[PDB]
Symmetry: D2
C-alpha cells in the first residue's frame, strides 16, 4: 500500500517563496489524488495480471505511470524544499556540480532552462547517471517518474505544472523559478547524491 | 503574420462562470505568447527550409506544433463561448448529436468525460469526422490541434490546461466543466457544423 | 501463463500468397520470442507490484506492451488467415462493412491505405467500436495491442512489420497487401464481429 | 533539392558481412524513397508555410521528420561503412572511447545493447554531446534523426530496421550486429569526431 507522506514543514514555512495556499492545495489536494489512484490502480492491476488479461494490463498502464509518478515525484519534491534552505550545496555535491556544469551558476541556468522549457505539464530534474558516474539534467512530461522512464536517480525535482505556481506567479513560470532557489534543501539533495556513490 | 484575435465580449462577460481574471490572463498573456512564438518559429522555419536543413526543420517542430496549435485552439475557443449562450443547440447540430450520441446529455457526458480525463495539459473536443459523416469526441495533448493531428474538423473545444480554471475552480477540473456548459456559443458550434455538411 | 498457439494450417497452406519461409520464421521465431518475454516480464511485474516498487513497474511497462501485444496481435493474425479464405464476407459483416465504408472495395482501399501508411513497424486493423456501434479502421505502432491502446475490438489485423513480408515482396509493401486479400478468413472475422453484437 | 547520394563502394563490397542484395535494396530502393518523398514534402511545406496554414504545417510533420530523417540517417550510414574497415579506432577517438566507456569493448557492448534493444524499427547511435564534451550512446525510433531530435552530433550509426539485415540474418538482429562491426569505417567516425572538437 501507499500513503500520502507528511510534509516536513507546514503550509507556510515556505512563504514568501511558495505561498501557503499552493503548498496546501498542492500536497493535500493533488498529491492525495495520486496516491488514492495509485492504490486503486495497483489493485486493478494485480487482477488483470492474475487472469493474464494483457488488454487490461495495457489499458491500466497510463493511470499507473501518471499516478505512480504523481506520488514519487511529489514525495521527492517535499523533501527537496526546506524553510532553512537555499544557498549553495557544499561538500562533494558542489564539486560534482562544478565538475559537471562548470560552476553552480551554469548549473542553475541549465536546470532553469530545462524546467522553463517543458511544454505543458512536467518536471525539471537534476539526476544521477549511475552508469556514467556524473550528474545529468532531464525533464519529464506530466508525472513520468525520472528513474523509471530514464534510469537517472532523482536528486532534485522542480515541479512545473501550472498548479505548482499559478495562483501566485500566474503565467510567469520564470519568476516562480527565481524563487524556488531560496527554499531548496541542499542537505537532502547532498544526501540523495551521497547514496548514489554507494 | 499571425495576430492575437480580439475577444467578441469583454473579459468579465462570462461571469460568474469564468472569472474575468482568468479571461484576461488567458487571452492577453497565454494566447499572446503562442502567437508571438509562432511568428518567430515560422520565420526560423523558412530559413531552415530554404537551405533544406532537415536538422533544423526537425528541431523546430515541437515549437511549431505547440505554438501554432496554441494559437489555433484558443482562437476557436473564444468563438465557442458567449455571454448569451448555454442551453442546447437545435436544428441539424442537435439532430446529429442525438444520431451519434443518442441524446444531448449523453453527448454532454462524454465530452466532459474526455475533458476531465486528460492527463496533464490538453483539450477535449467535439469534432466532425468528414470521411465518416459523423460527430466525434476527441482529446488532444498540450496544444496539439485537432484537425492537424487527427484530421477531425473542430466544432467545440474545451481547454483543460490548469491555466484555464485554476484561479477559480482550483484543482476541481469537474466544477470548471459543469460551469463552462453555460457559456457555450451554440450559434458558433452550429456554424462550424453547417460548413462540413456543404 | 502464456503459450505459443498452434497455427491452424501448416507453413505452406498460404502459398503462393505468403510463402512458407515467412510463415515459419514469423510464427516460430517472432511470435515465440514474444511469449517467452511476455511470461518473463509478467513475472518480473508481479514482483515489482508486491513490493509496490513503482520505478520497476514503470520500467517494465514497454516490454509488457511490446511483448503482450506481440503475443495478442499475432495470435489474432493466425486466425485471420485461411487457405480456403479470400472472397468477400457474407452475412451481416458485409452489410456492416457496406454500411460503414460504403462498399467492400472502399473498405479494402481504406484498410490498405492504413496498413501501407504506418511509418516503421506496425499493424493495420479493422476493429469494432462497441461504444458507437460501428466498424472502424485503426493502425498501431510496433506491437501496441488494439483493444488495450484504443478500446476497439480487433476483427482483422494485417501485420506490416517488415518481417511479415520482406524475404518475399522486399520493400514492396503494397504487393504484400494485394496478396493477403486472397488468404483472409472471412468466416473468423464474421465470428469476431458476431461476438461484438453480443 | 535532395539527392540520393552515391555509395563509396560497390554493393557487394561489404561481403560476407552485409550481402549485396541488402546493400542494393537499401540504397536504391529504401533510401531512394525517402529522398523522393522528402523533396515532395518540403514542396508541400513551403505552400503551407507561405499561407501560415498551421493546420497543414502540422499534418505534414510526420512525413517530413520521417523522410528527412530517413535521408540523413542513411547518408551518414553509408559513410560509416567501408570494405577496408573493422578493427578499432586510434588517436583521440579511441582516447575518448576509453575516457567515456572505459574500453573499446565496453563501448562496443553498450552500442550493441542499445541497437539490439530497439523495439521495432529504429537506430543505435554513437553521438557527441557537445554541451558536455562527451561521447554518448543513443537510440532513435523509426527515422527520427539523432541531432534534430536529441541535439547529439552523429558519429556512427547502426540501422536496426529489419530491412537492414533480414535477407541475411533473418530475425537474428544480434548476428547482424556482430558482423557490422567488421565493416565500420573508423576513418569516418574519427573525421566526425574531429569536427566537434574544433
Ligand atoms: Mn504537482
Ligand atoms: Mn489555454
Ligand atoms: Mn509479426
Ligand atoms: Mn535503412
Amino acid at each position: 500500500k501507499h500513503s500520502l507522506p507528511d510534509l516536513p514543514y507546514d503550509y507556510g514555512a515556505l512563504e514568501p517563496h511558495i505561498n501557503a495556499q499552493i503548498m496546501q492545495l498542492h500536497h493535500s489536494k493533488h498529491h492525495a489524488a495520486y496516491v488514492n489512484n495509485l492504490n486503486v490502480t495497483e489493485e486493478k492491476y494485480q487482477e488483470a495480471l492474475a487472469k493474464g488479461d494483457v488488454t487490461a494490463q495495457t489499458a491500466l498502464q497510463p493511470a499507473l505511470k501518471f499516478n505512480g509518478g504523481g506520488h514519487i515525484n511529489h514525495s521527492i519534491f517535499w523533501t527537496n524544499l526546506s524553510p532553512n534552505g537555499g544557498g549553495e550545496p557544499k561538500g562533494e555535491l558542489l564539486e560534482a556540480i562544478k565538475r559537471d556544469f562548470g560552476s553552480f551558476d551554469k548549473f542553475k541556468e541549465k536546470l532553469t532552462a530545462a524546467s522553463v522549457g517543458v511544454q505543458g505539464s512536467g518536471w525539471g530534474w537534476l539526476g544521477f547517471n549511475k552508469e556514467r558516474g556524473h550528474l545529468q539534467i532531464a525533464a519529464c512530461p506530466n508525472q513520468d517518474p525520472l528513474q523509471g522512464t530514464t534510469g537517472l536517480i532523482p536528486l532534485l525535482g522542480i515541479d512545473v505544472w501550472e498548479h505548482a505556481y499559478y495562483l501566485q506567479y500566474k503565467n510567469v513560470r520564470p519568476d516562480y523559478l527565481k524563487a524556488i532557489w531560496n527554499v531548496i534543501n541542499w542537505e537532502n539533495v547532498t544526501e540523495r547524491y551521497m547514496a548514489c556513490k554507494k
